[PDB]
Design an enzyme around this catalytic site. Structure first.
Site, mmCIF file in Angstrom:
data_model
loop_
_atom_site.group_PDB
_atom_site.id
_atom_site.type_symbol
_atom_site.label_atom_id
_atom_site.label_comp_id
_atom_site.label_asym_id
_atom_site.label_seq_id
_atom_site.Cartn_x
_atom_site.Cartn_y
_atom_site.Cartn_z
ATOM 1 N N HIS B 302 0.809 -1.216 0.000
ATOM 2 C CA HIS B 302 0.000 0.000 0.000
ATOM 3 C C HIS B 302 0.844 1.268 0.000
ATOM 4 C CE1 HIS B 302 -0.216 1.267 4.518
ATOM 5 N NE2 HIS B 302 0.948 0.699 4.255
ATOM 6 N N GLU B 331 -4.198 -5.884 3.960
ATOM 7 C CA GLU B 331 -4.229 -4.479 3.574
ATOM 8 C C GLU B 331 -5.651 -3.949 3.631
ATOM 9 O OE1 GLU B 331 -1.651 -2.632 3.385
ATOM 10 O OE2 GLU B 331 -0.170 -3.276 1.901
ATOM 11 N N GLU B 358 -4.325 4.193 -0.521
ATOM 12 C CA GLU B 358 -4.999 2.924 -0.297
ATOM 13 C C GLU B 358 -5.871 2.593 -1.507
ATOM 14 O OE1 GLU B 358 -4.146 1.100 2.310
ATOM 15 O OE2 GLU B 358 -2.880 2.751 3.015
HETATM 16 C C1 LIG Z 1 5.515 0.888 2.839
HETATM 17 C C2 LIG Z 1 6.399 1.787 3.651
HETATM 18 C C3 LIG Z 1 5.930 2.757 4.423
HETATM 19 C C4 LIG Z 1 4.513 3.247 4.484
HETATM 20 C C5 LIG Z 1 3.944 3.474 5.872
HETATM 21 C C6 LIG Z 1 3.283 2.440 6.548
HETATM 22 O O1 LIG Z 1 3.181 1.208 5.971
HETATM 23 C C7 LIG Z 1 2.725 2.631 7.816
HETATM 24 C C8 LIG Z 1 2.032 1.498 8.527
HETATM 25 C C9 LIG Z 1 2.830 3.884 8.389
HETATM 26 C C10 LIG Z 1 3.467 4.918 7.740
HETATM 27 C C11 LIG Z 1 4.024 4.728 6.473
HETATM 28 O O2 LIG Z 1 4.657 5.719 5.798
HETATM 29 C C12 LIG Z 1 3.413 6.108 8.588
HETATM 30 O O3 LIG Z 1 3.854 7.216 8.431
HETATM 31 O O4 LIG Z 1 2.699 5.794 9.706
HETATM 32 C C13 LIG Z 1 2.337 4.397 9.703
HETATM 33 C C14 LIG Z 1 7.872 1.516 3.545
HETATM 34 C C15 LIG Z 1 8.699 2.446 4.417
HETATM 35 C C16 LIG Z 1 10.196 2.201 4.356
HETATM 36 O O5 LIG Z 1 10.616 1.339 3.559
HETATM 37 O O6 LIG Z 1 10.938 2.876 5.103
#
Ligand SMILES: C/C(=C\Cc1c(O)c(C)c2c(c1O)C(=O)OC2)CCC(=O)O
Ligand SMILES: Nc1ncnc2c1ncn2[C@@H]1O[C@H](CSCC[C@H](N)C(=O)O)[C@@H](O)[C@H]1O
Ligand SMILES: Nc1ncnc2c1ncn2[C@@H]1O[C@H](CSCC[C@H](N)C(=O)O)[C@@H](O)[C@H]1O
Ligand SMILES: C/C(=C\Cc1c(O)c(C)c2c(c1O)C(=O)OC2)CCC(=O)O
Lengths: 395, 394
Positions: B302, B331, B358
């Site tokens: 997502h 998801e 999303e």
């Molecule tokens: C998919 C991803 C991050 C996306 C992601 C999340 O999934 C969740 C749960 C959260 C945040 C976010 O930015 C956030 O800001 O609050 C909760 C990879 C990040 C990385 O690789 O560092």
């Protein structure tokens, strides 16, 4: 208190609201919030405090840039789909729908079957004084609250000593000057601030409404034009929303309504021959030039200043007061520190964030008024209203 | 009408006293609808732009002066303003004014001049919530605050690439992606990894009873001769999600394997009582664990655009065993006809950090079909943000 006992209090507040009992609407709102906090898990508090609300501030602010609430108000009961609203606002359809759906989820607008509808709340926010209030709040106030953790860490977790020039407002906006002086230098936020004062507490009972302060028996009864042909002075009255409200409640008026504020505020008052007051410029830090009037009124003025300035503001009324005749009416929050209400803590922290100041308790205010040369006759309040009405006289 | 919501609240209240699925969450939503039906516009303005920005700021400041920890240790004795001002190093008046807003906002409680920690405040004293608070006020908050100015300047366009042309980059004045900004701005990478244990903590898990039928779909028919691995958690962080699974379905019939970035894996305490293997794996490379019973992701694709989400799922495909290997995608599934806070929350969190969004059920089906997967069933739970999408080889 457990959820079960809040559910009971919530239903008890409901009956009082159906019975139109004063303050019950605000108590229903209060019992609703206590239930939510009694039911939410820490992860939901975090999401709501740090995701929903910041995104809600941002989208409500953005809505004032794209005329969104104005469009929904115009549509009345027909509404608009995401395609029609994106077209009117010039926004990407997918971005708009994602921002609009959060407003829906945040209970600001509604949606049936892919159509979006304005609500009582969003149609109200379509008025221009709320639109400028929203801009002021997200552009000026928000950076100041956001600076709180680093500023107070940087100042040793102290109350602002001077107040107007050493508070979190200066640090967030990177100036040495006071909040009132910053407004002069940063258009359009002085216009936004002046419109914002007709909105920040609108739709709530006024000091002069039935069951609050007895205007007729205290001010009108005994009015003596041979002492002065002026009935009421609103000192720091902004563009005049409060003194105009007074004029329509108590007409035909036996005496003059006199509005005093800053020169720039006074000049921004559009001409109107149906207006019932005189718009005059006066510095609250100079002695009061309107002498022996029946009433001198102040709303949300000295609460923004330190102890020394607030005693100056009040004491500048003293040379103008006619003994036994002139009332001093102070429309300010009275903090009840043993019972913290959100309406008091809200304005207290807004004072810290803008003026480096605070809201005062009854004991604090009496100290202010005594040193100014005044003394309290009575204090009036109203269920659900944030401000009190303090009637004072010559000490 | 307010009266309508009042009756509806009492209905959900009785269902809540009956311990029914999602009733606790419905009571909260009904209470929020009641607030919105009663508040005049000035009250909404004060709560949106005064109460909430001040509340976030005090809760953030509290993590700098050990506030929630002092109130937790206090338990039932509590602490007055003078006692807490001394412990925190704060002016007594400044502290009292900030704490009364926490009282007025129902975060802590006050009686006869004493302050008391609550279930909420005590939990927020825990370090993962403390780091969650800091990340949110320091990293997430500035991105939201930039939404009006950024989208005004970019023409109100969805970010075209995703990770480098979004409000995050504009708010933090970098031309690099959010994950790289974490690498170069310690300790916010460590703050992010701890935050992934708290963001949905306390809410029912996909594997809980009544959610996904783990025993029927995964345990029954597990075959060590196909592979000894029961479940791979792809992108599973520091292993909180996979640790929960192992403790619900023990004695485990097969191995549990955690996969994430090397920096995440190397920050996990070495533990003898640990029930999973902590291994480094790039989700943009072919899945190296072959023929496992279950491949599971939670809050991973997502964060990425359509082309990259297709790749993330398709990298699982060469590893699956036809007729045996499950793909379980935990998801959110957006229901555009019924917008709920849980989805719009995380959707804009994606926009503010990743430049992503999303997705609807039709959106996810397109990604999985382009990855070479077909959906077997979609499981949801009342009051939970995410669905569990089971898929398999197309
Ligand atoms: C998919 C991803 C991050 C996306 C992601 C999340 O999934 C969740 C749960 C959260 C945040 C976010 O930015 C956030 O800001 O609050 C909760 C990879 C990040 C990385 O690789 O560092
Ligand atoms: N030195 C000064 N001279 C004249 N007016 C002043 C002043 N300092 C502050 N004010 C005015 O006091 C007001 C405080 S805000 C309160 C406005 C209005 N009474 C209301 O309740 O809505 C502002 O309009 C500001 O312009
Ligand atoms: N290329 C990559 N290789 C391995 N892991 C990656 C990755 N890109 C992102 N991730 C991981 O995907 C996770 C997304 S946050 C979700 C964490 C966990 N599934 C939960 O729901 O609590 C982060 O831990 C991040 O480290
Ligand atoms: C007293 C004073 C300002 C203080 C003040 C208020 O009174 C009110 C009602 C408000 C704010 C504020 O900062 C605010 O942010 O939201 C509402 C003088 C300002 C000037 O002289 O420009």
């Amino acid at each position: 208190a457990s959820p079960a006992s809040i559910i009971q209090e919530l239903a008890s507040a409901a009956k009082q609201y159906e019975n139109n009992e004063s303050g019950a609407r605000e108590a229903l709102i209060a019992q609703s919030r206590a239930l939510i906090a009694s039911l939410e898990v820490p992860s939901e508090f975090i999401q709501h405090t740090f995701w929903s609300q910041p995104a809600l501030s941002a989208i409500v602010r953005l809505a004032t840039d794209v005329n969104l609430f104005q469009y929904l108000k115009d549509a009345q009961e027909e509404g608009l789909n995401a395609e029609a609203l994106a077209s009117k606002t010039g926004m990407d359809v997918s971005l708009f729908a994602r921002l609009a759906r959060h407003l829906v989820a945040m209970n600001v607008i509604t949606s049936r079957n892919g159509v979006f509808y304005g609500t009582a709340l969003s149609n109200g926010l379509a008025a221009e004084n709320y639109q400028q209030s929203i801009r002021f709040c997200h552009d000026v106030s928000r950076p100041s609250f956001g600076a709180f953790p680093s500023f107070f860490k940087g100042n040793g977790y102290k109350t602002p000593a001077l107040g107007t020039t050493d508070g979190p407002f200066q640090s967030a906006h990177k100036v040495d000057i006071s909040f009132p002086q910053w407004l002069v230098g940063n258009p359009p936020y002085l216009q936004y601030f002046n419109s914002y004062m007709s909105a920040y507490r609108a739709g709530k009972p006024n000091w002069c409404d039935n069951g609050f302060y007895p205007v007729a028996d205290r001010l009108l009864n005994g009015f003596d034009a041979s002492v002065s042909d002026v009935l009421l002075v609103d000192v720091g009255g902004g563009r005049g929303h409060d003194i105009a409200t007074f004029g329509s409640q108590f007409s035909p008026l036996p005496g003059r309504l006199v509005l005093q504020d800053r020169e720039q505020v006074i000049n921004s008052i559009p001409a109107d021959e149906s207006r019932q007051f005189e718009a005059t410029t006066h510095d609250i830090f100079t002695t009061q030039p309107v002498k022996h009037a029946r009433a001198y009124y102040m709303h949300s003025v000295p609460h923004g200043f330190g102890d020394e300035d607030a005693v100056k503001i009040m004491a500048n009324l003293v040379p103008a007061l006619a003994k036994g005749y002139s009332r001093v009416l102070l429309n300010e929050i009275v903090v009840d520190e043993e019972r913290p209400v959100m309406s008091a803590t809200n304005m207290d922290l807004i004072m810290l964030a803008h003026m480096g100041a605070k809201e005062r308790t009854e004991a604090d205010w009496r100290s202010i008024l005594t040193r100014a040369g005044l003394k309290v006759v009575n204090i009036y309040s109203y269920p659900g209203v944030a401000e009190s009405l303090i009637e004072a006289e010559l000490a």
